[PDB]
Structure 1
Amino acid sequence: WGNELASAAARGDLEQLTSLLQNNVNVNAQNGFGRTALQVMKLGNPEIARRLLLRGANPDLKDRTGNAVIHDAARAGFLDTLQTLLEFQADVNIEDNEGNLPLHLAAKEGHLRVVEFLVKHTASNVGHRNHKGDTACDLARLYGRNEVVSLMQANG
């Protein structure tokens, strides 16, 4: 039921997902376009991620662009899902094809709370330079995220 599972997750339909999880399904089964339910999950539904991770969903999977779900969470400012990902051993220092950590993405987009949690409560490598030589703080400054910059240098 890989397709149905992925579909329910993508739609943020917890009810449908949970009923579908009553079957003997492989939560890591790819859908119509090679993506797992966790990968296409509609962010802002941390319980959907939890239920999937609980059943053994692999959080570190990457798409063609080398993007993992935690990358999307951090980039769009969805803290709860990002934390859920971490409580289930997701690699916080996973890099996309450009060498960016979730920290770079959260910093670049100005998501202060996410950056705060990553810098103070995770193993995020704050000094990690991407392939172009930029650290998360560098990108924050480049994009004018002055509050993120202050926060990062404050404690780091």
Structure 2
Amino acid sequence: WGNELASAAARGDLEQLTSLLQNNVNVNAQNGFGRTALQVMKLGNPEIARRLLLRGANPDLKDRTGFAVIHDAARAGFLDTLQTLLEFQADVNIEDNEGNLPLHLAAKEGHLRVVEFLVKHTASNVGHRNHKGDTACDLARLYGRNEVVSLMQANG
């Protein structure tokens, strides 16, 4: 179960995942390397996230390096999974090892729609400074994410 459930999620095989969920499984079980199905899930599959969360998957878990799935979703620009994570109470203000929130990571990578959603429809602390004293907008400015900067200062 735990291993196979993680495997199906990592591969993005919804059919196999749903087949596996018919069993009495602990969706928060850790695979061979200490990550759960939700943590290893191939992004771009919001339904897999939904099915894992509907079964009780903890979204706030962190990996080797203090990253929660929402950090990964924000950094890579996967709005759908970020939103489903949030509809299931995931913490928007979860910080990585350096004090960065999902907003810092989306801002840094120039994911305008993700930043817009976080700034406008979430509890994201827009003024949160990471450990080096940088806010998400500071990182957007540093990485040349002009549209993100403009958007951030237009509403926050």
Q: What TM-score does the superposition give when structure 1 sets the normalisation length? A: 1.00
Tell me how far apart the structure 2 counterparts of residues 48 and 42 of structure 1 sit (CA, whole Å): 9
Q: What TM-score does the superposition give when structure 2 sets the normalisation length? A: 1.00
Which ranges of structure 1 fall in alignment gaps of 5 or more residues? none
Tell me how far apart the structure 2 counterparts of residues 125 and 64 of structure 1 sit (CA, whole Å): 25
Tell me how far apart the structure 1 counterparts of residues 110 and 53 of structure 2 sit (CA, whole Å): 28
Instruction: Spell out, residue by residue over 1:86-141, the C-alpha distance to the aligned partner (whole angstroms, 9 max, x if none).
Output: 00000000000000000000000000000000000000000000000000000000
Q: Paired residue for 1:133?
A: 133
Which ranges of structure 2 fall in alignment gaps of 5 or more residues? none
| 1:64 Cα deviation from its structure 2 partner | 1.7
Tell me how far apart the structure 2 counterparts of residues 142 and 59 of structure 1 sit (CA, whole Å): 30
Tell me how far apart the structure 2 counterparts of residues 88 and 94 of structure 1 sit (CA, whole Å): 14
Tell me how far apart the structure 1 counterparts of residues 30 and 64 of structure 2 sit (CA, whole Å): 14
CA RMSD of aligned residues (A): 0.2
Structure 1 runs of 4+ off > 3 angstroms?
none
Instruction: Spell out, residue by residue over 1:28-51, the C-alpha distance to the aligned partner (whole angstroms, 9 max, x if none).
Output: 000010000000000000000000
Instruction: Spell out, residue by residue over 1:7-42, the C-alpha distance to the aligned partner (whole angstroms, 9 max, x if none).
Output: 000000000000000000000000010000000000
Q: Paired residue for 1:2?
A: 2
1:102-141 to 2 correspondence within 5 Å?
102-141=102-141
Tell me how far apart the structure 2 counterparts of residues 67 and 115 of structure 1 sit (CA, whole Å): 18
Tell me how far apart the structure 1 counterparts of residues 117 and 65 of structure 2 sit (CA, whole Å): 25
- The percentage of counterpart residues that share the same residue type is 99
| 1:151 Cα deviation from its structure 2 partner | 0.1
Tell me how far apart the structure 2 counterparts of residues 84 and 28 of structure 1 sit (CA, whole Å): 17
Tell me how far apart the structure 2 counterparts of residues 122 and 26 of structure 1 sit (CA, whole Å): 29
Tell me how far apart the structure 2 counterparts of residues 83 and 151 of structure 1 sit (CA, whole Å): 19
Tell me how far apart the structure 2 counterparts of residues 67 and 78 of structure 1 sit (CA, whole Å): 15
